[PDB]
From a paper:
To elucidate the molecular basis for the substrate preference and catalytic reaction of [name], we determined the crystal structure of wild-type (WT) [name] in FAD-bound form (mLDHDFAD, 1.70 Å resolution) and in complex with FAD, Mn2+, and D-lactate (mLDHDFAD+Mn+D-LAC, 1.73 Å resolution). There is a non-covalently bound FAD at the active site, which is apparently derived from the expression system, indicating that FAD binds to [name] tightly. In the WT mLDHDFAD and mLDHDH405AFAD structures, there is no density for metal ion and ligand at the active site. Later structure determination of [name] in FAD-bound form confirms that there is no metal ion bound at the active site (see discussion later). In the mLDHDFAD structure, the substrate-binding site is occupied by a water molecule. Comparison of the mLDHDFAD and mLDHDFAD+Mn+D-LAC structures shows that the binding of Mn2+ and D-lactate causes only very subtle conformational changes of a few residues composing subsite A including His398, His405, and Glu442, which rotate their side chains slightly to better coordinate Mn2+. Comparison of the mLDHDFAD and mLDHDH405AFAD structures reveals no notable conformational differences at the active site.
Numbering used by the authors: 27 to 291, 293 to 303, 305 to 333, 337 to 484
């Protein structure tokens, strides 16, 4: 990057908010995945949306790539600057606005994390349910199309994003559903909000998100349930969903994951396990009765039932790091397939068998209520042959999911790792259509290049 360009950036955001230092760039050249660090040429922290617009227009017209950066917790290399350019760290815009408790909505800027929002909402009787394990930027979660353990009942980001404020690549400001609007449903024109959810920073920069809030549940019960086999755990899950029990969370851990989480955080029996209800005192008893009946018929243990619940779900949210702690110094790559629920037993049991018959260390954890799971595969950062084997494993598993009518990623996204799988998933006309949308919004191809498509 030229000296005149760097001075132009500083003129927009202020000297302290532009850095070309190698260490600062290296910290912004990678996320939590195994993808190799590729540092941007500069990092910029805009202080308001006018500055985001002016930074984007400066980069765009000079032919400099733009990489939006939230909290850097992605796992597909979305923030790696494969073509250099300017990394725009958005987290100094960190204000919550327009809290409308009577309408169940709130507007947040990119520096707001889910934990910050729910802290702000204490005493309101409302909460925001979409809960990825990491304390990520909510706007970053909109950009990746994230979900979480609560999504089986309360929906994903796609279900809970009502509106987005987006700086387009050339700096124009778009409010996808209209400035200041919030409502339950609309048929007005084409739905632009859904286009930018899951766009991973390749179509523009999300500078605020309007979120749907939910009422806090009247009563909560959490429990764990140990099974004799992966088959028995996943059959129970499928049967619970087919019985229409409105479980609030239903998370699967294989025995490897359960032992890893025990060691990193618990003392649950080392076995394929379900972490599991919201409603009134009496509603819970019915849900529990129907769910315990199904789990018992598949060999589940009696359920192992305001501090131990928090510790239970904190251990699940840290499963990624529990897995990494199995082999210190290693990095991780995760699969993320989502299949029609009736096919979940076959593919989960097959994955377990394939991990066991392999030399790789893999732990399985997942949002199985959605038909979704992660195979977290560990890699030695220097063992290039192990790295080729994890990639081959992840690609085989993704193709098996596609063969079953599913998708190669339920929530993490495509980034750098799944671009060939996406082409297989949607086919030539799907790829061309996505590319035409990318081209009309980002003609010069400068909005996070090398990702998704
Ligand atoms: C321990 C752990 C657990 C996780 N659990 C889950 C889980 O349960 N579910 C799940 O879905 N994910 C999960 N993730 C992945 C990650 O937390 C999510 O993908 C999250 O949405 C990433 O947000 P971020 O701001 O940290 O993203 P970053 O890594 O900063 O960016 C991710 C991508 O989005 C783009 N981007 C970021 N912010 C914006 C913006 N404001 N506008 C436009 N583009 C933007 C970036 O360019 C990049 O391509 C987990 C990650 C970790 C480390």
């Amino acid at each position: 990057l030229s000296q005149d360009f760097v001075e132009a950036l500083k003129a927009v955001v202020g000297s302290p908010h532009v850095s070309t230092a190698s260490a600062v760039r290296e910290q912004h050249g990678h996320d939590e995945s195994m993808h190799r660090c590729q540092p941007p040429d500069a990092v910029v922290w805009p202080q308001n949306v006018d500055q985001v617009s002016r930074v984007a227009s400066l980069c765009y017209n000079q032919g400099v790539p733009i990489i939006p950066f939230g909290t850097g917790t992605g796992v597909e290399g979305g923030v790696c600057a494969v073509q250099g350019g300017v990394c725009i760290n958005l987290t100094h815009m960190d204000q919550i606005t327009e809290l409308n408790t009577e309408d169940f909505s709130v507007v947040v800027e990119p520096g707001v994390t889910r934990k910050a929002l729910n802290t702000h909402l204490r005493d309101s009787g409302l909460w925001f349910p979409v809960d990825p394990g990491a304390d990520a930027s909510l706007c970053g979660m909109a950009a990746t199309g994230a979900s979480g353990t609560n999504a089986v009942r309360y929906g994903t980001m796609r279900d809970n994003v009502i509106n987005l404020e987006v700086v387009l690549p050339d700096g124009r400001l778009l409010h996808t559903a209209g400035r200041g609007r919030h409502y339950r449903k609309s048929a007005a024109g084409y739905n632009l909000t859904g286009l930018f959810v899951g766009s991973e920073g390749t179509l523009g920069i999300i500078t605020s998100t309007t979120l749907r809030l939910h009422p806090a549940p009247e009563a909560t019960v959490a429990a764990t349930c140990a099974f004799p086999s992966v088959q028995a755990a996943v059959d129970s899950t499928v049967q619970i969903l087919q019985a229409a029990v409105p479980v609030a969370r239903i998370e699967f851990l294989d025995d490897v994951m359960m032992d890893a989480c025990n060691r990193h955080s618990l003392n649950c029996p080392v076995a394929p396990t379900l972490f599991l209800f919201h409603g009134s005192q009496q509603t819970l008893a019915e849900q529990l009765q129907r769910t315990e009946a199904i789990t018992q018929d598949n060999g589940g243990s009696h359920f192992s039932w305001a501090e131990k619940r928090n510790e239970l779900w904190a251990a699940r949210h840290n499963a990624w790091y529990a897995a990494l702690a199995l082999s210190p110094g290693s990095k991780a790559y995760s699969t993320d397939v989502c299949v029609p629920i009736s096919r979940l037993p076959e593919i989960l049991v097959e994955t377990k068998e394939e991990i066991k018959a392999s030399k790789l260390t893999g732990a399985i954890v997942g949002h199985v209520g959605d038909g979704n799971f992660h195979c977290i595969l560990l890699v030695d950062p220097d063992d290039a042959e192990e790295q080729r084997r994890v990639k081959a494993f992840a690609e085989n598993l993704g193709r098996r999911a596609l063969a079953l009518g599913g998708t190669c990623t339920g929530e993490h996204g495509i980034g750098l790792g799944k671009r060939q799988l996406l082409q297989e998933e949607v086919g030539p006309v799907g790829v061309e259509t996505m590319r035409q949308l990318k081209n009309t919004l980002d003609p010069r191809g400068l909005m996070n290049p090398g990702k998704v498509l």
